[PDB]
């Protein structure tokens, strides 16, 4: 099971982030994913400007004690100029949240050779108003279609076929009901044949297991130890030491 963990690292202090990076170094990352846009629910967007001040303090030094421990860094953006600054540092995967809702994404992914995660959404910010409702083989069906045409896009603009991932966007205009059921279907995902991100850790899906916010980890852990059985290339996580044990548990039962 050649499952990678992305170590998720929110930056909505720099010395913090720093420390947090340092600790999912040694807990087991394979990547540490820099974001600094909160797509909470209820987080109002903040300009692209605003986004890069947040990063352009810490990113150089994720970078470094990253890249020293054979750990790459993955940016969670939806803004193509966000991406290209922080490609310019050196990173190694635009986690493109917006899949291509910024036009001038592909052109950054191709004239960087980088790997591109696009992630399906109903428009963000999220919105109870934008959700899917009906049956959920054709809400998959349907993220197969957008994705498809997102990485035609890609290709079509000069971004090379092995460098992108596919993510189905757990929660986002997804309630939990369809967030399991996309999950446990994940395989029809991967069939496709590009690997597959996917981001269950702590959402929401899991208020219907009822299991509160603030005891998620353990949960998640379960549905690492599945996803990682299914041979989910990237798990985008927040507790790097319990996905490194779902992994490992994977593994012991191939
Ligand atoms: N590729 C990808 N990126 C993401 N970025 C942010 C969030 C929102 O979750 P958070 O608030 O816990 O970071 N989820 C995803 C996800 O599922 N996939
Ligand atoms: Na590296």
Same mark, same amino acid.
């Given at each position: 099971?050649?499952?990678?963990?992305?170590?998720?690292?929110?930056?909505?202090?720099?010395?913090?982030?720093?420390?947090?990076?340092?600790?999912?170094?040694?807990?087991?990352?394979?990547?540490?994913?820099?974001?600094?846009?909160?797509? $909470?629910? /209820? @987080?109002?967007?903040?300009?692209?400007?605003?986004?890069?001040?947040?990063?352009?303090?810490? !990113? #150089? *030094?994720?970078?470094?004690?990253?890249?020293?421990?054979?750990?790459?860094?993955?940016?969670?953006?939806?803004?193509?100029?966000?991406?290209?600054?922080?490609?310019?540092?050196?990173?190694?995967?635009?986690?493109?949240?917006?899949?291509?809702?910024?036009?001038?994404?592909?052109?950054?992914?191709?004239?960087?050779?980088?790997?591109?995660?696009?992630?399906?959404?109903?428009?963000?910010?999220?919105?109870?108003?934008?959700?899917?409702?009906?049956?959920?083989?054709?809400?998959?069906?349907?993220?197969?279609?957008?994705?498809?045409?997102?990485?035609?896009?890609?290709? $079509?603009? /000069? @971004?090379?076929?092995?460098?992108?991932?596919?993510?189905?966007?757990?929660?986002?205009?997804? !309630? #939990? *009901?369809?967030?399991?059921?996309?999950?446990?279907?994940?395989?029809?995902?991967?069939?496709?044949?590009?690997?597959?991100?996917?981001?269950?850790?702590?959402?929401?899906?899991?208020?219907?297991?009822?299991?509160?916010?603030?005891?998620?980890?353990?949960?998640?852990?379960?549905?690492?130890?599945?996803?990682?059985?299914?041979?989910?290339?990237?798990?985008?996580?927040?507790?790097?030491?319990?996905?490194?044990?779902?992994?490992?548990?994977?593994?012991?039962?191939?």
């Amino acid at each position: 099971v050649t499952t990678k963990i992305v170590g998720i690292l929110n930056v909505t202090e720099a010395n913090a982030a720093i420390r947090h990076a340092t600790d999912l170094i040694e807990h087991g990352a394979d990547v540490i994913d820099v974001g600094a846009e909160s797509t $909470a629910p /209820g @987080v109002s967007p903040i300009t692209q400007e605003e986004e890069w001040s947040r990063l352009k303090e810490v !990113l #150089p *030094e994720i970078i470094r004690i990253a890249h020293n421990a054979h750990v790459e860094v993955s940016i969670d953006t939806r803004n193509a100029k966000t991406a290209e600054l922080a490609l310019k540092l050196g990173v190694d995967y635009i986690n493109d949240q917006g899949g291509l809702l910024d036009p001038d994404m592909p052109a950054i992914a191709a004239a960087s050779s980088a790997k591109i995660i696009i992630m399906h959404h109903f428009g963000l910010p999220v919105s109870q108003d934008r959700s899917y409702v009906g049956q959920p083989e054709q809400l998959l069906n349907e993220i197969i279609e957008w994705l498809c045409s997102r990485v035609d896009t890609l290709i $079509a603009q /000069g @971004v090379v076929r092995e460098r992108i991932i596919l993510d189905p966007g757990l929660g986002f205009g997804k !309630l #939990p *009901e369809y967030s399991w059921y996309i999950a446990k279907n994940i395989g029809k995902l991967k069939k496709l044949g590009f690997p597959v991100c996917v981001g269950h850790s702590r959402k929401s899906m899991f208020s219907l297991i009822p299991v509160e916010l603030s005891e998620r980890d353990v949960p998640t852990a379960m549905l690492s130890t599945f996803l990682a059985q299914q041979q989910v290339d990237f798990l985008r996580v927040h507790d790097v030491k319990l996905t490194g044990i779902s992994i490992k548990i994977a593994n012991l039962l191939v």
